[PDB]
DNA sequence: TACGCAAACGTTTGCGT
DNA sequence: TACGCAAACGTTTGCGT
């Protein structure tokens, strides 16, 4: 029941009790014992409300995510699910699916619960947002997905999605082609328009010309994928090669193609970004680029452990980096031979 | 800051601040307002950790779901989270991944957070584990994945894993097929050994007989798919037609006949189980029994909920059922016409 | 040597007048 | 009428002797 019941038992004082149940002190072993004993058969166990109230933190982190379903998502979270467990941290999960509302709800019933940290992963980022998370300057936090250092007041982690698109239209370049698409995520986030913008530069470096029939955005999701491959053959003249703004949609992609009886790659060819875990068996084993999601993880717990236990101030940023990964999506353009 | 804090800049007591606050109690406008004035320059934020410290509740649940990356889990776990968010809760993450020690680990770093209700989907539950349980039957919860009431101590839905098993070797059967192999997910779980043996008294009700090489244990797992789909199909007489313990190892199993250049459905049958969002784009669109995951998501939380505001004392089960959904994986088998 | 007193952390709420 | 006193919830920890 509660401490009192404890040291009553054990005919000790609770400071006793918390004592040898912290061992902040030296307890007699006799003394130990007995309080142990006593604990259980009381099946006593010690309440962090009680504790936290009076040590001033909560051994718990907030992560204020976007949706959690998605692959992608998905993946990172249990990553940082795995770091705030061998750490002692207690992870509550929230997803505001973009919802300013459902953001400053969460936001707030956060702060209440006193999180010792928060974990930012919103994908889109607008002034109303970016505000009210400066609100809470006061929390220790990190953005996990921005593209630059959106702010002064936090940590981020940053992926190189310019990188990322560049290697993905170089690849492609490389293989042979010269007529090639892009179904890109919202402009409205990094890994989208990061993204995108990375993959435009290497072919304004070939002299490519991307025409806008050409191009269609995506929301990151199967369907989006589907219907923008779909858009893109079903008209006359059509590129010899796509690239793909994430995995679940090019997997979009890779269904509407069969469909339409397409042959990938022998018809057309498919590059995706994110390297889900599920990716190499797409069917055909899905070409793409790989974001580190685990040390994304990583990294942002570790930012923050660090301002949340080193009591730092300055904000602070670290890169991360994708890499090609070479599958059976994709094959040679009618160019290769010719470079 | 405090309370107290606001209460000065307000010239009232903290009772009144309270008061206000939480709309205990009538208070004066002029009154009200004030300190909501002093709230707001002040910036403040109430406690909850004092608060449940006062109160006896702390507005949050805890989920020991076994993994959260995994398509199924993954979106339950988004379900839960809606719930909890709707009806003011706050969720806890964590995934125990089948180890005990894990699991004696979340389930007492839960307790001491002293979270209202306890949301539960082990997948295996050897006898340790429900041992551990119990010893929290003080706390109210419900496991979300059996397929019958394990104990007494708890509330429970159940999916009816059979019934779903039975209709897909149903469809099997009405389709033709007579020559069918099984890759069931690990024995030791319900979605394993029940749509199993939900598959299997079909088959005796067809007098069909399923030889072994013709039966290959996965993980849930996409790579485990691969390799039993490859295992089955490495062989001199192969079934006509598969079905498969989960969507995800099933693509398992599609990957790897394209990689034989086995033609789905044309060369070989294939049926799923769960419908995971993404199944329909599955390349073919993949035939799956669908798991209602949304209201196992809903009907768990509300279990919880009513015996926790509720107080209810005995525990309950809730059944859940599966349905057939037809895509494209399945094609006409040797048997049809004859029927 | 080994342990206890009592004050505090930030709230909520029964009784008041 | 409208508001305040003070005790409590379950711990931790500075000073003790
Ligand atoms: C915002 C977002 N959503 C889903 N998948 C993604 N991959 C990269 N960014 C993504
Ligand atoms: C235990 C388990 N893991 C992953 N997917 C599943 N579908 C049904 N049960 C599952």
């Given at each position: 029941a509660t401490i009192k019941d404890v040291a009553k038992r054990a005919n000790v004082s609770t400071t006793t009790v918390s004592h040898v149940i912290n061992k902040t002190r030296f307890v007699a072993e006799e003394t130990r014992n007995a309080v142990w004993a006593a604990i259980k058969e009381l099946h006593y166990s010690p309440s962090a409300v009680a504790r936290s109230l009076k040590?001033?933190?909560?051994k718990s982190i907030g992560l204020l995510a976007?949706?959690?379903?998605?692959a992608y998502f998905a993946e990172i979270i249990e990553a940082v699910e795995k770091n705030c467990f061998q750490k002692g941290y207690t992870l509550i999960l929230g997803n505001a699916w973009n919802n300013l509302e459902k953001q400053r709800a969460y936001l707030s019933m956060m702060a209440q619960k006193r999180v010792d940290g928060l974990l930012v992963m919103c994908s889109e980022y607008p002034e109303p947002l970016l505000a009210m998370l400066e609100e809470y300057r006061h929390i220790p936090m990190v953005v996990m997905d921005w593209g630059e250092a959106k702010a002064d007041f936090t940590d981020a982690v940053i992926d190189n999605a310019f990188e990322g698109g560049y290697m993905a239209g170089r690849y492609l370049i490389e293989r042979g082609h010269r007529e090639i698409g892009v179904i890109p995520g919202?402009?409205?986030a990094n890994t989208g328009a990061g993204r995108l913008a990375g993959f435009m530069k290497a072919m304004e470096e070939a002299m490519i010309k991307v025409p806008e029939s050409w191009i269609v955005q995506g929301d990151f999701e199967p369907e989006s994928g589907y219907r923008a491959m779909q858009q893109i053959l079903s008209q006359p003249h059509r590129p010899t090669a796509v690239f793909c703004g994430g995995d679940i949609m090019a997997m979009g992609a890779l269904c509407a193609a069969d469909e339409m009886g397409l042959?990938?790659?022998?018809?057309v060819s498919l590059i995706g970004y994110d390297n889900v875990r599920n990716a190499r068996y797409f069917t055909p084993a899905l070409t793409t680029i790989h974001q580190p999601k685990d040390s994304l993880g990583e990294t942002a717990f570790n930012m923050l452990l660090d301002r949340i236990?080193?009591?730092?101030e300055e904000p602070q940023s670290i890169e991360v980096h994708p890499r090609l990964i070479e599958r059976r999506s994709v094959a040679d353009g009618p160019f290769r031979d010719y470079r």
């Open positions: 040590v001033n933190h909560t976007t949706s959690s379903e998605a919202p402009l409205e042959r990938v790659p022998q018809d236990v080193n009591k730092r």
